[PDB]
Swiss-Prot record, chain B:
Disulfide bonds: none annotated. This is Large ribosomal subunit protein uL22A. Component of the large ribosomal subunit (LSU). Mature yeast ribosomes consist of a small (40S) and a large (60S) subunit. The 40S small subunit contains 1 molecule of ribosomal RNA (18S rRNA) and at least 33 different proteins. The large 60S subunit contains 3 rRNA molecules (25S, 5.8S and 5S rRNA) and at least 46 different proteins. uL22 is associated with the polypeptide exit tunnel. Signal peptide: none annotated. Pfam families: Ribosomal_L22. GO terms for cellular component: cytosol; cytosolic large ribosomal subunit; preribosome. Component of the ribosome, a large ribonucleoprotein complex responsible for the synthesis of proteins in the cell. The small ribosomal subunit (SSU) binds messenger RNAs (mRNAs) and translates the encoded message by selecting cognate aminoacyl-transfer RNA (tRNA) molecules. The large subunit (LSU) contains the ribosomal catalytic site termed the peptidyl transferase center (PTC), which catalyzes the formation of peptide bonds, thereby polymerizing the amino acids delivered by tRNAs into a polypeptide chain. One of its GO terms (molecular function) is structural constituent of ribosome. CDD domains: Ribosomal_L22.
From Swiss-Prot, chain D:
It is found in: Cytoplasm; Nucleus. One of its GO terms (molecular function) is structural constituent of ribosome. One of its GO terms (biological process) is cytoplasmic translation. Component of the large ribosomal subunit (LSU). Mature yeast ribosomes consist of a small (40S) and a large (60S) subunit. The 40S small subunit contains 1 molecule of ribosomal RNA (18S rRNA) and at least 33 different proteins. The large 60S subunit contains 3 rRNA molecules (25S, 5.8S and 5S rRNA) and at least 46 different proteins. Component of the ribosome, a large ribonucleoprotein complex responsible for the synthesis of proteins in the cell. The small ribosomal subunit (SSU) binds messenger RNAs (mRNAs) and translates the encoded message by selecting cognate aminoacyl-transfer RNA (tRNA) molecules. The large subunit (LSU) contains the ribosomal catalytic site termed the peptidyl transferase center (PTC), which catalyzes the formation of peptide bonds, thereby polymerizing the amino acids delivered by tRNAs into a polypeptide chain. This is Large ribosomal subunit protein eL32A. GO terms for cellular component: cytosol; cytosolic large ribosomal subunit; nucleus; preribosome. The lineage of its organism: Eukaryota, Fungi, Dikarya, Ascomycota, Taphrinomycotina. The modification Phosphoserine is found at S74.
Curated annotation (Swiss-Prot), chain E:
Involved in the biogenesis of the 60S ribosomal subunit. The keyword rRNA processing applies. This is Ribosome biogenesis protein nsa1. One of its GO terms (biological process) is rRNA processing. The gene is nsa1. Its main location: nucleus. Component of the pre-66S ribosomal particle.
Curated annotation (Swiss-Prot), chain F:
It comes from Schizosaccharomyces pombe (strain 972 / ATCC 24843). PROSITE patterns: BRIX. This is Brix domain-containing protein C4F8.04. Disulfide bonds: none annotated. Residues 20-41 have a biased composition (Basic and acidic residues). InterPro entries: Brix (IPR007109), IMP4/RPF1 (IPR044281). GO terms for biological process: assembly of large subunit precursor of preribosome; cytosolic large ribosomal subunit assembly; maturation of 5.8S rRNA; maturation of 5.8S rRNA from tricistronic rRNA transcript (SSU-rRNA, 5.8S rRNA, LSU-rRNA); maturation of LSU-rRNA; maturation of LSU-rRNA from tricistronic rRNA transcript (SSU-rRNA, 5.8S rRNA, LSU-rRNA). It holds the Pfam family Brix. PANTHER family: RIBOSOME PRODUCTION FACTOR 1, U3 SMALL NUCLEOLAR RIBONUCLEOPROTEIN PROTEIN IMP4. Residues 93-282 form the Brix domain. SUPFAM superfamilies: Class II aaRS ABD-related. Residues 15-48 are annotated as: Disordered.
Length: 192, 148, 125, 124, 340, 305
RNA sequence: GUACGUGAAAUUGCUGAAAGGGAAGCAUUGGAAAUCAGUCUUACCUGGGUGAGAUCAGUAGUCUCUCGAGACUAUGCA
RNA sequence: UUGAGAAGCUCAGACGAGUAGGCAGGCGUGGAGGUUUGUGACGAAGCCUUGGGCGUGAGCCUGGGUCGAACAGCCUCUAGUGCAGAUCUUGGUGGAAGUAGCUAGAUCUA
RNA sequence: AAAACUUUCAGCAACGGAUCUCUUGGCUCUCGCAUCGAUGAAGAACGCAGCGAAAUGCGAUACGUAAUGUGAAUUG
């Protein structure tokens, strides 16, 4: 069984395998380490224990060889206490006389899943900027319409049109301080 | 359309464009190089002089087969010609740019040829070389006293 | 899945049949759904479109518009609906073609031929 | 643990800079009378197994992490136990709708992302 | 239709809008604006509770007045000036009418009940910060009050009385005891306490000890719509996260016997309680809605877009208009069309 | 698209294009001949055949203000959040310019150029985990009137949110085409004089709020001697920010004959309004006064500012 | 924009920067200039106070598996 | 002590030119079966780039720009599968050159 | 030595039509069938389309008539 299963899945084809350059990973949800190994394969290991998180609560999942052909009842689940010391002892009691490597890998996953929940709670409290996507179509539309808007704006024509307009209305004092004498003389004769 | 130069915004530029013009590309490249950067009013006189052979267009890059002339001393060289067909096209384009500036309401006493570029149109053993010509005319940018 | 060896699943032959279809076939290719009221009153789900039919545009920019079908353009598989136009450069209104499956028939230009069609396709009136 | 690279310059194909028709990708010189093949003085170097880098630090980025290509949130969750060895790298074809959810998920997992600020802006 | 509106500058506008009117469309018939009232920001309008055909208008300075809209122009039928000794730091957060008593709840928790005909005022102290209070329509002497960090609690004057209570002996401070108080929901998945900030309350028993099991719904500042039941328990019966932005108002739709809620992101939608989901959304409303009133099929939405939007119970835009001034309240006077 | 042959339909198009050019030329030459003989047909054609432009064919909206003064509009502006600037109090604007967390050198260059445009405006580097609402409440007690926050990421400034202390409306913009003074051809060196402000084309009611908010950042007593002008121009919902150094002179274009010679000072950028919030800026829990929808901005003839 | 999807290379024009006693030319090592990656303190431990609530109750129910294992509900928060 | 992809892990020493030729393991391309509860109009493929990274290398990943409708990793199957040369084939394009010269005007100019 | 000129790099504009994507086409295999003509065939020519770029259709009844069927089009 187990050694036949491993040869079929570990070396011919598994739909859960991600082939990386330095290591192979496992897409299985029931893998403690997340790697493709002989010891961490949930399919090839008839007795297997893992820790996974459900809506903020970490559970110990265990399966035995005697439930291998009943997929609905294959994995059993217990609640791990929020107290870390009690959670470690819960894994020790439920995994009693299991190999020390399997208890070791379950306690390692409990630490990483506890840190991730801790980091998830601290991220909620903090105020972080929301990432808003960049839309390639709207950027192209606004860049083109902006170019048309800038050309149609005629900024220099409109700036000098208003600046001369407020010179006529005398928004300054008696005579403005920004105008040369000859220009001011031309303004007075023209406007009157 | 869009020209080769980052100017030709509405600000102060008037554009004139000629595509697939039936003139030699190498001759037009020399005429454009001469009148580039020169005032619009002066350019009309220079093109008028060339038509009457009073002035010569110096051929710098495509100088092969261009004889020595005494009218090129203004530009520092002695290889010059008197192209007419190429000058005629540039006269038509400059008038178009001048008319475009006048319609825009631009100040016509400060217009200079800010950018003029000649590109090779598709070739059509007698495949000649038509020309794409684009001209931008803008006012000479000036400074103003800061505060004193 | 199709099991008849008399019908082709070839995309090459399906596309050639649709785009090379004659006028008497494009009459059936240009069919439209009926409104819920007509559908449960005439006992018919869909009918080929026709001039004078009153339709409501269901999809596209003109979604929600209503009007009679002035003419059906079978060459391009388009409907031309009254008052559903687009302004041109010179201000002349160019009608916009709508696919027949993008409209719904809210009122039928009933004729004896179509009345016979209703009783033929399990309908009633 | 420091990453040592035996070489940083790439191995260019011989005479690849004289012709556009000859690409930069390395090709072994088959010419017998070629000075590059016989490895004279002044001739360019060739890919040898001696240039191979340390096995422990192979595939490692300058920050000490190994790149892991990620296409969705499920990929980034695999690095729960390997966040000190691997960095998430979102694929180039992953849309901005998923890039944001990968980056937020990778934040709680304590996983570095090599291109976390791509195709998005910020709003504090 | 026919609706009345008030603005931040305290002016009252009697809009004569009719079906199909859209001021954005240049071909529409402009509504017949009939404006009156003040033109001062110091006494801008806050609430517009509809007393049958009369209309009660509350202002920022406490000048509560009653208008009669059965005839045009409406006339100030009565006036009342709230003591300024209660408004130095507080403000009116709700103002409702039940059995000849006008309620003037403030932010500090002070409750002011005024009898209409007898002009009798009786104070009532309540709990801490108040953001929403509501009176039971069918049952006299019931208050549902809530606020920031203050869960909803039900105050009852008559314990049962088995049919009703006479208006004169109502709202005594020695007869009101809280017969129900809210219990907060469990901590979130991250072991974070779910914060409590009540923003609106509505009694939903019309759409779902005599007259027990007070079925009501509350909306919170954290975009949560909670349905309560005093009989099931002190915890919400069901909780929905209907928006990310704080919810603004909540109420019932008599036409379809459903519920509507609005948030500060300019989103008003109908929540189907039977299906436990949001069905539809009032499209076309821009800017956060300042107030919403429903009268039969019609529902009037006004907000920060300086517009009045008219919809039916099926979210179809019956009418729309622009009112220049920034509005703070809206009231439907007549659902039927003007020509009728 | 009837013709399936590319060469044939290219020959058919050219023969139809030539015919279209020819017959339009004949009717244009005939019209010119018959309208130069009778100037009447020329002067009514020009007055009738005015070219159409996006501004002329802009969609109709009633939110636009009118030339005539209306009491209701002026009564609303006399007690709003910006009233302390336009009233007889004449409270000088004290600006606080800050950036997003962990800004780069390039954001400082834009900020330094932006501080030149605003005398009496100081910069504070954004430190740690202080939020915009906290900055606003802290800046209000320090005597500040308007808070400007520059958002930058990937070494590029792309947004600008300005809030009006203490509870005034908060406007969120998106900056584009940022261009410091060094990148502008024939630029100038800004002096310490207070620049004048000119604001154009803010016709809609929402334009008044944004124009008043932008006006409220400038000291209302400009130094005439320095003759520096800062321009905010809203064209097609695009707000163009520019600063020049003018000088009146003689030009042959205007009927009066006087024109100014603008020399750009910088910075040069464009702002697109994305959101207006009533009250201090809180992106999650703010009252939306206005929120731009990209779907209905695809109508090139419809504008909100 | 019918010289019409995308629009590579060879090739050409203009503009900018740099270099330039009869070749370029590539390699190795640095300088200079330009330009990038490239990162940060923020968390842990230990309190105390305050309230909060379950996997805590000298607690009561329901559901799914099989006593007790998960999911919830009501109440208390000692 | 958790280090059993036993096809793994681990310890030690020696050694390293290479034509013909022998052998092994890998990179890439079109299509096929399976798989990734795969990627994509919130932008697939392609192309551009003095952006960054990985590999001894073949090559691969990625940012930015452009773009507009499809596409990829893994196991296996398959083949019209990888170019600098063939006075290679087709297409495009250069220097030679505005030259050799051949239509006008006055050897010169057009 | 700066200009010009030359070279290199980059930006923009040309030139060209690679790449990508598809496709009413080809190619291959299998299956069913048996039907030209002196009662004028195959082919060729010349005519008819209101215009049709050709191409298609048709034969002085000329892009067809009769009959049947569908039932409202035709379309540049």
């Amino acid at each position: 069984q187990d050694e036949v299963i491993w040869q079929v899945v570990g070396h011919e084809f598994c739909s859960y395998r991600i082939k990386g350059e330095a290591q192979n990973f496992c897409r299985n949800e029931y893998n403690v380490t997340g790697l493709c190994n002989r010891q961490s394969c949930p399919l090839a290991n008839s007795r297997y224990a893992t820790v996974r998180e459900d809506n903020g609560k970490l559970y110990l999942y265990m399966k035995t060889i005697e439930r291998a052909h009943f997929p609905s009842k294959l994995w059993q689940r217990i609640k791990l206490s929020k107290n870390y010391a009690k959670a470690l002892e819960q894994i020790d009691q439920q995994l009693l006389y299991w190999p020390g490597r399997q208890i070791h890998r379950c306690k390692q996953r409990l630490t990483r899943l506890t840190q991730y929940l801790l980091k998830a709670r601290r991220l909620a409290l903090k105020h972080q900027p929301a990432l808003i996507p960049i839309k390639p179509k709207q950027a192209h539309r606004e860049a083109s319409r902006e170019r048309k808007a800038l050309i149609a704006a005629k900024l220099e024509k409109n700036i000098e049109k208003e600046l001369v307009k407020r010179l006529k209305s005398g928004v300054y004092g008696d005579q403005p301080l920004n105008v040369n004498e000859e220009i001011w003389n031309k303004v007075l004769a023209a406007r009157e | 359309v869009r020209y080769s130069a980052s100017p030709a915004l509405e600000t102060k530029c008037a554009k004139a464009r000629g595509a697939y013009l039936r003139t030699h590309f190498k001759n037009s490249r020399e005429v454009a190089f001469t009148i580039n950067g020169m005032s619009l009013k002066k350019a009309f006189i220079f093109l008028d002089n060339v038509k009457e052979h009073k002035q010569a267009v110096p051929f710098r890059r495509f100088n092969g087969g261009v004889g020595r002339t005494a009218q090129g001393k203004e530009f520092g060289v002695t290889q010059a010609r008197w192209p007419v067909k190429s000058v005629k096209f540039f006269y038509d384009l400059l008038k178009n740019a001048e008319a475009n500036a006048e319609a825009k309401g631009l100040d016509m006493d400060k217009l200079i040829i800010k950018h003029v570029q000649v590109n090779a149109a598709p070739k059509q053993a007698y495949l000649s070389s038509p020309s794409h010509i684009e001209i931008i005319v803008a006012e000479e940018e000036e400074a103003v006293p800061k505060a004193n | 899945m199709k099991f008849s060896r008399d019908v082709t699943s070839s995309r090459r032959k399906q596309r050639k049949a649709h785009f090379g279809a004659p006028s008497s076939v494009r009459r059936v290719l240009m069919s439209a759904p009926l409104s819920k009221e007509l559908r449960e009153q005439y006992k018919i789900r869909s009918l080929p479109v026709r001039r004078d039919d009153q339709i409501t545009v269901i999809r596209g920019s003109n979604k929600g518009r209503e009007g009679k079908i002035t003419s059906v353009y079978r060459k391009k598989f388009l409907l031309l609906i009254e008052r559903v136009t687009r302004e041109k450069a010179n201000g002349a209104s160019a009608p916009v073609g709508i696919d027949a499956s993008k409209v719904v028939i809210t009122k039928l230009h009933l004729d004896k031929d179509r009345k016979d069609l209703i009783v033929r396709k399990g309908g009633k009136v | 643990v420091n990453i040592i690279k035996k070489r940083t310059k790439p191995f260019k194909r011989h005479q690849s800079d004289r012709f556009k028709r000859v690409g930069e990708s390395w090709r072994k010189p088959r010419g017998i009378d070629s000075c590059v093949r016989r490895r004279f003085r002044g001739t360019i170097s060739m890919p040898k197994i001696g240039y191979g880098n340390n096995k422990k630090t192979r595939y490692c980025m300058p920050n000490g992490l190994k790149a892991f290509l990620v296409r969705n949130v499920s990929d980034v969750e695999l690095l729960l136990m390997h966040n000190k060895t691997y960095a998430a790298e979102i694929a180039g074809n992953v849309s901005a709708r998923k890039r944001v959810e990968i980056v937020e998920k990778a934040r709680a997992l304590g996983v570095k992302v090599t291109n976390a600020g791509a195709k998005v802006r910020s709003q504090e | 239709m026919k609706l009345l509106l008030g603005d931040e500058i305290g002016q009252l506008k009697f809009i004569e809008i009719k079906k199909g009117t859209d001021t954005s469309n240049p071909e529409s018939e402009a509504p017949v604006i009939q404006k009156f009232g003040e033109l001062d920001r110091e006494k801008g309008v806050l609430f517009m509770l509809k007393h049958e055909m009369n209309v009660f208008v509350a202002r920022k300075n406490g000048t509560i007045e009653c208008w009669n809209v059965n005839q045009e122009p409406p006339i100030l039928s009565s006036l009342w000036q709230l003591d300024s000794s209660l408004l130095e730091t507080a403000s009116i957060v709700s103002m409702k009418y039940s059995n000849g008593w006008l309620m003037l709840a403030l932010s500090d928790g002070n409750l002011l009940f005024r009898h209409i005909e007898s002009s009798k005022l009786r104070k009532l102290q309540l709990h801490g910060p108040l953001s929403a209070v509501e009176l039971h329509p069918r049952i006299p002497g019931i208050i549902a009050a809530g606020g920031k960090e203050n869960d909803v609690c039900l105050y009852s004057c008559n314990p049962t009385c088995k049919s009703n209570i006479d208006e004169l002996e109502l709202w005594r401070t020695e007869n009101v005891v809280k017969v129900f108080q809210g219990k907060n929901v469990k901590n979130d998945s991250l072991n974070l306490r779910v914060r409590v900030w009540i923003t609106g309350i509505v009694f939903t028993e019309d759409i779902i000890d005599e007259s027990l099991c007070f079925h009501f719904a509350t909306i919170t500042h954290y975009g949560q719509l909670r349905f309560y039941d005093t009989k099931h328990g002190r915890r919400p019966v069901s909780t929905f996260d209907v928006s990310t932005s704080p919810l603004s108002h909540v109420g019932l739709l008599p036409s379809i016997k459903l519920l509507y809620f609005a948030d500060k992101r300019a989103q008003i939608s109908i929540f189907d309680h039977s299906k436990k989901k949001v069905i539809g959304r009032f499209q076309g409303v821009k800017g956060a809605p300042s107030s919403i009133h429903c009268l039969g099929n019609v529902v009037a939405i006004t907000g920060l877009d300086r517009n009045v939007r008219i919809f039916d119970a099926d979210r179809k835009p019956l009418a729309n208009a622009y009112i220049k001034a920034l509005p703070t309240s809206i009231i439907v006077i007549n659902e039927r069309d003007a020509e009728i | 698209g009837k013709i399936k042959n590319k060469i044939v339909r290219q020959q058919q198009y050219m023969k139809a294009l030539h015919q279209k050019n020819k017959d339009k030329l004949e009717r244009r030459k005939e019209r010119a001949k018959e309208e130069e003989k009778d100037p009447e047909k020329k002067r009514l054609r020009l007055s009738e055949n005015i070219p159409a432009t996006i501004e002329s064919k802009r969609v109709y909206d009633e939110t636009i203000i009118e030339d005539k003064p209306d009491e209701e509009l002026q009564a609303e502006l006399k007690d709003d959040e910006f009233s302390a600037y336009f009233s007889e109090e004449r409270k000088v604007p004290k600006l606080l310019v800050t950036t997003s967390k962990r800004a780069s050198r390039k954001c400082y260059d834009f900020a330094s150029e932006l501080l030149d445009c605003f005398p009496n405006a100081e910069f504070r580097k954004r430190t740690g985990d202080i939020e915009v609402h906290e900055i606003a409440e802290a800046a209000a007690k320090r005597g500040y009137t308007d808070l400007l926050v520059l958002n930058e990421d990937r070494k590029k400034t792309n947004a600008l949110t300005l809030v009006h202390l203490p509870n005034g409306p908060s406007f969120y913009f998106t900056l584009s085409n940022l261009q410091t003074a060094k990148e502008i051809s024939n630029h100038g060196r800004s002096t310490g004089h207070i620049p004048e402000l000119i604001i154009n084309n803010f016709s809609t009611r929402l334009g008044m709020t944004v124009a008043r908010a932008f006006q409220s950042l400038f000291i209302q007593t400009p130094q005439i001697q320095g003759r520096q002008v800062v321009t905010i121009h809203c064209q097609r919902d695009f707000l163009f920010f520019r600063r020049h150094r003018y000088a009146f002179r003689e030009k042959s274009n205007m009927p009066d004959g006087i024109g100014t010679g603008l020399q750009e000072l910088g910075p040069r950028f464009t702002m697109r309004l994305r959101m207006v919030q009533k009250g201090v800026w809180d992106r999650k829990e703010g009252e939306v006064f206005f929120e731009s929808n990209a779907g209905e901005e695809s109508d090139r003839r419809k504008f909100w500012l």
